[PDB]
């Protein structure tokens, strides 16, 4: 959090919604002529084939599994949250410009954790890294670390040297610093501070970080936490809520982006229900280990 304005994140990525839709359409027209065949899925022989868009594209169903597998490798290796967040940012910025039906996902996850841990000054050697990626997944990863580091080379090639990225956690620390002032004089309980930190940790899914500044995401998760803590006669009682409403109004952090972030959190927690490991894990198994 040096200065997000006049950084590289505000300039050469973080495009608007129409530009992201146009780039996704260019990705779709790129993968159109690649394989019009589809996928030969077999279990009971049984061989139906999807259309190019029934699923296993970048809409929703595998992103939760992607975040779960990144976090599993993270807490297995026991590295801090900023490295896994930067690895998830590299994951999304690579899958925007390349498909997933041609790239081994587990090596991409281990490669992104490797590159983010190296660039955010908390290094992990390649021996223990590929040994953990083998001891958690005994398949889908070669013993050669050279293939992992050639993946590292092409990952550095694709996201063209834009490695460092500001995080919403620093702006959350700044907001909870400024909320201890004589204009407001409030402070959350430590369980709701952990709830807001967990919501920020959960919002790295669902494709929001490529559109808005991170302080808007921090304000959105803190608003969801405060307005979901306040109610569990008068309507807007518990004046922590009142001081937060006056803070969000009197400061000119704008609306209509926080609305989209809250609606995106609602649709993420809606899409979490119809999610199962079985179909996507079997689809990966029949997409790589045929």
């Amino acid at each position: 959090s040096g200065s997000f304005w006049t950084s590289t994140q505000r300039h050469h990525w973080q495009y608007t919604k129409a530009s992201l839709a146009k780039e996704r359409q260019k990705l779709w027209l790129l993968e159109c002529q690649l394989f019009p065949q589809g996928l030969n899925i077999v279990m009971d022989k049984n061989i139906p084939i999807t259309h190019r868009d029934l699923h296993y594209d970048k809409d929703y169903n595998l992103r939760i599994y992607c975040y779960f597998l990144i976090m599993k490798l993270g807490r297995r290796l026991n590295i801090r949250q900023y490295a896994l967040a930067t690895a998830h940012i590299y994951l999304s910025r690579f899958l925007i410009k390349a498909s997933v039906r041609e790239i081994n996902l587990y090596m991409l996850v281990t490669t992104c954790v490797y590159l983010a841990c190296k660039v955010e000054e908390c290094p992990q050697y390649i021996r223990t890294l590929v040994s953990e990626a083998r001891t958690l997944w005994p398949e889908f990863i070669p013993p050669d670390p050279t293939k992992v580091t050639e993946f590292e080379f092409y990952l550095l090639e694709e996201l063209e040297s834009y490695l460092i990225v500001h995080h919403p956690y620093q702006s959350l620390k700044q907001i909870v610093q400024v909320l201890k002032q004589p204009p407001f004089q409030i402070t959350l309980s430590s369980d709701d501070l952990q709830n807001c930190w967990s919501l920020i940790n959960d919002s790295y899914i669902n494709d929001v970080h490529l559109l808005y500044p991170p302080h808007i995401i921090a304000v959105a998760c803190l608003f969801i936490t405060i307005s979901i803590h306040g109610k569990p006669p008068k309507n807007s009682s518990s004046p922590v809520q009142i001081a937060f409403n006056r803070f969000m109004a009197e400061s000119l952090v704008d609306l209509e982006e926080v609305m989209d972030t809250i609606q995106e959190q609602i649709t993420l927690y809606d899409h979490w229900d119809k999610y199962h490991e079985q179909w996507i894990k079997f689809l990966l198994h029949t997409l790589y280990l045929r």
């Binding site: 040096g2 955010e120 580091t149 993946f151 080379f153 460092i164």
Partner: protein, 357 residues
Amino acid sequence: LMANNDVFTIGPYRARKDRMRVSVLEKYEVIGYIAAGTYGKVYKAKRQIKPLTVFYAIKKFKTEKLHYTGISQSACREMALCRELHNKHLTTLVEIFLERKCVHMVYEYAEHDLLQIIHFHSHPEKRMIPPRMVRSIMWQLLDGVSYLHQNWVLHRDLKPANIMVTIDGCVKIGDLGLARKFHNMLQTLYTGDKVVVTIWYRAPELLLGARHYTPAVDLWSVGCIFAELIGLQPIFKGEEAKKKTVPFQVNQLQRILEVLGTPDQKIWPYLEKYPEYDQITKFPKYRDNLATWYHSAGGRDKHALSLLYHLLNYDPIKRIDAFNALEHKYFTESDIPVSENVFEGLTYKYPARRIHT
């Protein structure tokens, strides 16, 4: 059930990428190998198409000095920092190009370095540098290190080799070799680097093995730069050193003592908390000869003396940061103005770089 080195991996995505690329034989072309970096070679790049001749530079990080060694920390931190940092006083990173094996950065080519200025003044005619040029270069370098300081990124490399100048006299501190962003240190500095900036320009915190060195080590390096530029010799031209993970530089501490004098608990408040403070107790007890050493130079007294007092102080609480050093009775009080162009009135070309063709 186990995997081998033949499973489905990145392979197809190579092909879709490898048809359309751009090479170093296409956008630019080579001219001549200038031997600057032994670990990573530097070349000169003619633009491939009043005369506007070759003014580019390539660094080609071929670390093998085979099959795909990964990126190093000294290359990863440089590629992370140089691409987004941008100022008038930094080398502008134009492009990264990733060849069959390694990385090729292209910056702008510079006219000369400060070491070439000292070597031009190393002929025994002894053209002592005029104080206007050295104070303007000092102002510009301090503004560059101010921009590098305030954006939360250290700079543990400051030598007269990798500080450049150009036509129109613009100082560019052009090497982010060992910089790091110190906002959220997940692992502390002593657990990540364990050694620092080169022997002739390190700090007494680093010489005494501090494990949480503050951002004032660049100011000590800048003061050593200025003492070098005022004496035409490196101020502590130190002697290199040989289960302890440090060689301690047991002669460099003797040099920096006998030039500046001993510390105690009154010019240094917490040196007792150091790991090997007792290892400083095995030297003699010199007073100083700082004013005498400035007296054995040109006669521009009473204002460089106070600045060299303040910069060369091993009290890392009371050292002087950049924006509070850019007003220290040297640039406000003037007899000829400190400009951006440092080559006004001085009308000679310090000759061009030695290009091994």
